[PDB]
Design a protein around this ligand. Sequence first.
Ligand SMILES: *[C@@H]1O[C@H](CO)[C@@H](O)[C@H](O)[C@H]1NC(C)=O
Length: 234
Amino acid sequence: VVGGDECNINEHPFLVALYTSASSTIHCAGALINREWVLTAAHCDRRNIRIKLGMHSKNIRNEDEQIRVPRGKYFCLNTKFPNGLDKDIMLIRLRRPVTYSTHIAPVSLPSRSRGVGSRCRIMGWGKISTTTYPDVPHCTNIFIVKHKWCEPLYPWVPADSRTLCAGILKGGRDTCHGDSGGPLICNGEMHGIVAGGSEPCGQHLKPAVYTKVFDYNNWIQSIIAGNRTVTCPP
Ligand SMILES: *[C@@H]1O[C@H](CO)[C@@H](O)[C@H](O)[C@H]1NC(C)=O
């Protein structure tokens, strides 16, 4: 995240970090939905995913920090692109649940749709400057802007994409490499999943793309309930 500062240690209990059994590098983030489910971006998937919960600094572990592996991973199977990037979302079921604590808590799904003008907060362990990754997650506030700003830049995100375009038109604040899969928080609810932006991040007139969670609420709840034939919103 560029244009922000280290997050308050207690403000991101739902934030999880994703890495692999082969690399300790945080390639993406995710959000805890309940005691055994994490919501993230589909492109964040990897063969041997490892999830860190309750973490702030990568070098000073919180008392309640936990590590988990998936017992199940679920995707949208009715996508426009074969690589599935038009519906960049995935559910990960933890092999073993976690218990809530100061640094581990669930984030609520959106109770209603929110759009242009909404002030939201982004967070992650992604780049904070040219080739610079922090040891602690960074946070900053951005705005959901007219979806038209994104459509041209990412011609694979059409006008009807179930996505939110967000950032600061003047530039300076944006999600970056390593932040994908993280939550976009608006009014205390997770309204988006970081999907991707332009490189370098934070450029003038180049907001980023966030998967619009609200549209996937029913799919998410059905999957968590155990349904395995439910499809993602068309
Ligand atoms: C799964 O969800 C679909 C869509 O809501 C529904 O039609 C179907 O009956 C459900 N199946 C189960 C396991 O109840």
